[PDB]
Design a protein around this ligand. Structure first.
Ligand code: DU7
Ligand code: DU7
Ligand code: DU7
Lengths: 282, 282, 282
């Protein structure tokens, strides 16, 4: 199924019938960072498997729902269970849910992920406002836009210079200052490792040389599809380890440690993003 | 359809029947840089769609013809409408037209493209003679030769050390000196970004660190197929912007600006390449 | 055919019926470096084409056998004819033979390859004990684990920090010292170039900047599958040229020169690995 205008329209039609909500904000939350979705008010939960043309996700299993409702007086749509390219999903499968958001009315997309720290200033538990990226899959002919261009959504050759909105970054920092946790908030450049192996010690050393501050396995595909069709983006990484320190000290990286960091910061991240949604410009 | 000896032979048979021309020079021209093809003498235009085993190009649309005839007394074959890998074409689809050129008798291939400047010496409107490359798709298991080797055309493991012929570079510079535009002509290393997003500001900064002078989304696949089967190459980039300056000044990159640069240099590039063809060794 | 638990079990069942050997050591030997396999004692040769669910290898041709037997009193299984990803094999085809080794009882995998030297200390004929890697295909969404995770074999997100066992490296060096060829033995970081073109002169210069000591087109996919399912690895490169010197002196790289180096070191490498197998811990 191609992520074209006709197919995205059919999915949006189903959703609008079922939900009644016209959202102008979208959210995609990282693993262990989805509590906010359970607090959406007057909400409607739509399993992906029920929506025409949505990608099949049963081989991976686990949760996969679209959730619509209200937060802070604002109308939002959330993806509960994101699609990652290391699972084998195609370019068309990743892109279709974001293009459906566009047809539903989304103008701003907020994204969180868990990532490894490269910059020596980063500790476990810190947050990084993403200000740019290095897309190794894109340089290597696995960009999410490889294929025919869908002209109704955007141009053949997108410019990513303003993919990460500066005013949204400034609003997120302002709110952290108001609640006295700005000492946790950094900015930086995100390297996309296709994955699913964690970056090796020598890959981490290479990324430090190349100007990367953070490394992870998600987010860049969604950012590019959003930028192509004119949706503004704020993306925030939660740092689970510093891979450069771990390489110097021969310390292991593992998913169990990652999820414990997520639990430690989940409630603060939920409160932060609730306020961001409330404060977004009108 | 595999780009093998049998399938390329069937395409060449069709062409030879229709055209009568036995070319020993091939040309592939960049977008907005194809005026020379309209001035081929005693010419024959063959739509790709008519040629056995040529790749299907109707999803992308736009022009796609093989043109045979004479320039400056020399017999040439031109591709009018090149195939780019960011459109989703396979390794076999890119390679088959170059291997057909080989069977038709081509010994020299001249290639132009539009590209972004990385080296701080490069301005919009400059030309770069390509002397080497950094192939990010090739390092990342998307090389144009991934697949079974077609032994009749070349070896399993090609050496690219002499892919860009030095004497052809020297002849191109000599002609620029004769016509007093050598101040526009540089040499440099080309980075292949699979695309179709332009290089991000942080990718541009990375390429500067890694010794790249220019970045673009074409040319390297054709160069590798030509080198594999023993065809000499001259490749020239027309610079449309300096991405490092644009990153420092927060200035946007876009296809409209690119095509205006192409129009500004099209007639000079046509005259230059006409003389190169005329002067090629016998 | 997916490299899952059911399919690997069916292959292992065939093998166990035919061979009687329960191996706890596996070997994968580089091209021209396979003489040891001909000296396996009380051996059984099983063509890949006869084994249920093994990948089809007839397009590439050439030898493809599993060989079981004894070396130095130890029970081993060897792959005679390795699968390389530049031939077009899928992730599932590369992984299935290593997962079969796991089900057969393999706890240690010894691997050799031929490679190019980047570090200026490396000469043709030197050996490099691999201590880490830079996986360009993995960064670029062509990692061998892209796809659904096979949970019975290992975790969704493997850590590669200890992929190259330190004690095995120390044993290999100890044996070289006992036989007075330690002056040939280095350690270093391996860059995986998907291939099949040799690294270009400018790619070689880039790899030097990024901390790579050696570059080649194999080994990293097998190492990752082995690490995922808990098999210890020793990997050794035989250096056929120094690509940085060749770039400075405009000297060519070619498969014929490579195989002559292999012949020069084959008998010493055979003796070295025979002793390593004999000395492996119990
Ligand atoms: C949570 C996480 C993700 C990634 Cl890709 N890398 C690290 N080191 N940590
Ligand atoms: C014309 C062009 C092509 C490319 Cl790939 N990049 C830039 N900056 N400009
Ligand atoms: C034997 C070999 C392999 C590779 Cl990938 N590169 C070089 N220079 N040499």
């Amino acid at each position: 199924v191609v992520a074209n205008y006709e197919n995205a329209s059919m999915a949006a039609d189903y959703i609008k019938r079922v939900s009644n909500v016209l959202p102008d904000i979208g959210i995609i939350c990282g693993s262990g960072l989805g509590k906010l979705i359970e607090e959406i008010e007057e909400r409607k939960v739509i399993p992906y498997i029920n929506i025409p043309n949505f990608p099949k996700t049963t081989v991976a299993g686990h949760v996969g729902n679209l959730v619509l409702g209200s937060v802070g007086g604002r109308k939002i749509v959330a993806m509960q269970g994101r699609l990652h390219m290391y699972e084998g999903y195609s370019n068309q499968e990743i892109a279709l849910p974001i293009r459906v958001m566009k047809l539903l009315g989304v103008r701003v997309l907020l994204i969180t992920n868990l990532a490894g720290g490269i910059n020596r200033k980063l500790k476990s538990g810190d947050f990084v406002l993403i200000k740019g990226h290095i897309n190794f899959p894109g340089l290597g002919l696995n960009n999410v836009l490889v294929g025919p261009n869908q002209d109704e959504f955007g141009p053949r050759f997108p410019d990513l210079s303003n993919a990460y909105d500066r005013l949204l970054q400034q609003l997120a920092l302002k709110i952290a200052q108001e609640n006295d946790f700005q000492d946790l908030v950094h900015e930086g450049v995100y390297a996309f490792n296709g994955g699913p192996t964690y970056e090796s010690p020598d890959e981490s050393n290479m990324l430090l040389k190349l100007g990367c501050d953070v490394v992870g396995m998600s987010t860049v595909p969604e950012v590019i599809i959003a930028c192509h069709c004119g949706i503004k983006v704020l993306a925030v990484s939660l740092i689970a380890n510093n891979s450069i320190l771990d390489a110097e000290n021969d310390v292991s990286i593992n998913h169990e440690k990652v999820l414990a960091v997520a639990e430690k910061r989940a409630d603060l991240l939920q409160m932060w993003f609730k306020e961001i949604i409330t404060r977004l410009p009108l």
